[PDB]
C-alpha cells in the first residue's frame, strides 16, 4: 500500500510580508525585481513573473500576503526569495491584502484546515501549484480555497476589491 493522499491546502501556509521597493530586473524584460523585508542586515531581492499584470510601481513598498513556509524557485536565472499572492484574470490583476491590520506577523490559518510543514515546503514538492487551481474569489470576491475561508484565525478575512470568479495565485 501507499499513502497517496490527494492535494489539500492545510499542507501549506501564508503570512503578511513587506515589500521595500521594486525596480527593473537583470534577466529578461518579462520579469521585475522587487525587495522583501526580512530579519537580515539588508532586504532580499525577489523575482515575479509578470509582463502585463499589476505593475511593480503599484506594488512598490506594499504589504500583502506572501509565502510563509512555501519555497520559491528560479525564474529565468534569478532565484526569488518570496512570492506575492494575487488574483489573476484576463481583464485585470489585483494583489490580495486583508481589509485592515496587515501586520507583518499575521498568518492566514483556520481550524478548518489544520496542518504544518515537516522541514520546509521544498519547491520540488510542487505543493503550492498543486492546489492553486482550487483557489478562487467567490461572487463577493472573497478568496476561497478548497471551499474553506481565507482569514487570520478568527476575524480578518482577506478579500479582493473587484476580482470576482478569478483564480488566485
Amino acid at each position: 500500500a501507499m499513502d497517496s493522499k490527494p492535494i489539500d491546502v492545510s499542507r501549506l501556509d501564508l503570512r503578511i510580508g513587506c515589500i521595500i521597493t521594486a525596480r527593473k530586473h537583470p534577466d529578461a524584460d518579462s520579469l521585475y525585481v522587487e525587495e522583501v523585508d526580512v530579519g537580515e542586515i539588508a532586504p532580499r531581492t525577489v523575482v515575479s513573473g509578470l509582463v502585463n499584470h499589476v505593475p511593480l510601481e503599484q506594488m512598490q513598498n506594499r504589504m500583502v500576503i506572501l509565502l510563509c513556509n512555501l519555497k520559491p524557485a528560479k525564474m529565468r536565472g534569478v532565484l526569488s526569495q518570496a512570492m506575492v499572492m494575487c488574483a489573476s484574470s484576463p481583464e485585470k490583476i489585483e494583489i490580495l491584502a486583508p481589509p485592515n491590520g496587515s501586520v507583518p506577523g499575521d498568518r492566514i490559518t483556520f481550524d478548518a484546515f489544520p496542518g504544518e510543514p515537516d522541514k520546509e515546503l521544498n519547491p520540488k514538492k510542487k505543493i503550492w501549484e498543486q492546489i492553486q487551481p482550487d483557489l478562487h474569489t467567490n461572487d463577493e470576491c472573497v478568496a476561497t480555497y478548497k471551499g474553506v475561508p481565507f482569514e487570520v484565525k478568527g476575524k480578518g478575512v482577506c478579500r479582493a476589491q473587484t476580482m470576482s470568479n478569478s483564480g488566485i495565485k
Side-chain angles (χ1 to χ4, degrees), residues 20-76:
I20 295 301
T21 200
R23 53 188 179 271
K24 281 171 46 170
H25 198 259
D27 304 356
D29 43 82
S30 351
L31 299 327
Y32 278 97
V33 135
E34 174 178 90
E35 268 161 339
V36 63
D37 170 55
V38 287
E40 271 276 21
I41 303 176
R44 303 182 86 184
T45 331
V46 305
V47 43
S48 300
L50 23 72
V51 203
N52 287 288
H53 309 147
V54 57
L56 81 160
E57 293 309 289
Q58 278 179 24
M59 301 190 298
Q60 250 184 67
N61 191 219
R62 204 178 266 263
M63 36 175 65
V64 296
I65 284 88
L66 279 110
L67 44 78
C68 194
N69 286 274
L70 278 167
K71 283 215 74 61
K74 276 199 165 203
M75 177 57 77
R76 212 111 197 190

Side-chain angles (χ1 to χ4, degrees), residues 138-157:
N138 199 4
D139 168 80
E140 66 169 88
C141 314
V142 64
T144 312
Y145 47 8
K146 282 286 148 207
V148 332
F150 196 51
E151 64 179 303
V152 178
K153 225 67 237 292
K155 120 248 120 266
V157 61

